[PDB]
């Protein structure tokens, strides 16, 4: 009832430790949720 | 839109957990009506004691405006 959830890396189910290491704290969130204005991508640079 | 307001006492009986746990076992919480059937079963299958229940939110009448 009262523990705020935290990341886990659990040992047991088999394969789950490495999957868990990868899903959380190894691979972040990509993809912008909204679909409103695509980011153009031809402009990496900020010269001035 | 109907929330019950239950109260229980569940006593851990399988492990002797070692830190904290006071609020885990004696607590008051409104739980919405959709889920209260399962929460009660879960309290009962852990040897919990369901001390009190209330309607709290909803009218104890029904049909329109209940299952929202």
């Amino acid at each position: 009832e009262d523990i705020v959830p935290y990341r886990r890396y659990p040992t047991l189910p088999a394969g789950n430790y490495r999957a868990s290491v990868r899903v959380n704290d190894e691979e972040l969130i990509s993809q912008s949720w909204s679909s409103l204005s695509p980011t153009y991508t031809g402009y990496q640079y900020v010269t001035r | 839109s109907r929330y019950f307001k239950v109260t229980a006492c569940i006593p851990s009986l399988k492990r002797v957990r070692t830190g904290r746990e006071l609020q885990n076992t004696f607590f008051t919480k409104l739980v919405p009506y959709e889920n209260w059937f399962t929460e009660q079963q879960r309290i009962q299958k852990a040897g919990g004691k369901v001390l009190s229940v209330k309607l709290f939110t909803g009218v104890q009448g029904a049909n329109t405006g209940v299952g929202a």
Binding site: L36, Y40, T41, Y43, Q44, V46 | -
Partner: protein, 161 residues
């Protein structure tokens, strides 16, 4: 993560060595700079928002980056970018307190280069945003702390490029 005091212990533990004279000298070299690190962190923390504002003003905005077609166009993305800036500033302040860059690898750089490639986030422009915050920081913290703060901003920026 590790810090200078902790790194000395784990670096010796793997060799099973008591701390010896060489170890004790390293730890002294950290402790002797410690008070200065603290003062510098209090300046950065309390000027956080102004550092980002002045760093963005010198290195990001008034540009094609903030115009339609630019990656920090839209209030959404402008907010995400200066949010990022705050991360960098905040973590660099951790690294400098710890006297160890390991936290910048574990919690900031790991996967970030490719994350930015995948979203289209301009890397070179982000580095300039880092090196502008360093410039501001080095003025605010003074002779005592300037070189020590600076290195973890430089760690961050060669971590992306």
């Amino acid at each position: 993560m590790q810090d200078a005091i902790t790194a000395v212990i784990n670096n010796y533990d793997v060799q099973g060595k008591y701390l010896d004279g060489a170890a004790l000298d390293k730890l002294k070299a950290y402790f002797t700079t410690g008070a200065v690190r603290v003062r510098a962190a209090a300046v950065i923390s309390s000027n956080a928002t102004t550092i980002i504002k002045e760093a963005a003003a010198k290195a990001l905005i008034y540009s094609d980056l903030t115009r339609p077609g630019g990656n920090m166009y839209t209030t959404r993305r402008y907010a995400a970018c200066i949010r990022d800036m705050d991360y960098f500033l905040r973590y660099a302040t951790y690294a400098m307190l710890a006297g160890d860059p390991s936290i910048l690898d574990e919690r900031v750089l790991n996967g970030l280069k490719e994350t930015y490639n995948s979203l289209g986030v301009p890397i070179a422009a982000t580095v300039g945003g880092i090196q502008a915050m360093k410039e501001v920081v080095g003025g605010l913290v003074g002779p005592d702390a300037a070189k020590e703060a600076s290195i973890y901003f430089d760690y961050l920026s060669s971590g992306l490029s």
